[PDB]
Amino acid sequence: SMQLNQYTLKDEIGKGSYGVVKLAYNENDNTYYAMKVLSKKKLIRQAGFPRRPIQPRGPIEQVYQEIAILKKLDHPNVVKLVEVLDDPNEDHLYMVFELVNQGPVMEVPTLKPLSEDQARFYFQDLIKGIEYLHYQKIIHRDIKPSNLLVGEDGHIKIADFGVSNEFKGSDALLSNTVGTPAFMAPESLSETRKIFSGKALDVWAMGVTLYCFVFGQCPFMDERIMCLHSKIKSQALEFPDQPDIAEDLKDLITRMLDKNPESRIVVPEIKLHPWVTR
């Protein structure tokens, strides 16, 4: 192990493009937390070498976005940021989260999808979490199974706010394509620069997520980003023969994955859907 301020850093629980996640025991409150360790130089370098004398939110700015956003949130279905250790003289940046003990609900693809009942239970948490974020005027933009952490209590917490957008008024008005390709809504994948609303992007990703829950793979898939984007825009939704799923679940998924955001089901409607109300 190693000591970092009041934390004893132990088992490594995750490693990804961002940085590493360690189990951390806090000696002052005798509680365990997840500590994410990042290098600032590495995040900067990950953007690519700066060009000599539209540009995306670089990786370091995604990290700082996440900090700024999580400081203002408090909901049981959203991961809590507990502390940030950021010395201007150190390269390392440390983000301490509450421990969500079972880790991501699913790696996609999987041969072991969730049962309908487990899918519903987690989906209920997802709805509550997203309804809260939208109420707080945040569009998540990276909803997917791997960003949904299952706690010791069996409930989901939403993570990964790096490409999120805040808005004023009723909705975000967005023109940039960010997040995870398989989960990006068709209206964000237009040839010509267009403006699209934010909340509906999150509903679409929720739909892809719920399809993943019960089927273990995305409804639209291709190893090539550009062909994937084309399938998201042009392919009609299909369900496999097996596993058979309830008609009310197929209806919900169909309505979340309406390609036209004007008619796509909204969260108040999802909360009323028969599959959700059991």
Ligand SMILES: CNC(=O)c1ccccc1Nc1nc(Nc2ccc(N3CCOCC3)cc2OC)ncc1Cl
């Ligand atoms: C967005 N995804 C993440 O933040 C993330 C990805 C991979 C691993 C961990 C991880 N982040 C957390 N992970 C946890 N908790 C985990 C996660 C995975 C694990 N694994 C331990 C080994 O068996 C599989 C589960 C344990 C754990 O706490 C004991 N708590 C909070 C956060 Cl923020």
Ligand SMILES: [Cl-]
């Ligand atoms: Cl995923």
Ligand SMILES: [N+]
């Ligand atoms: N996170």
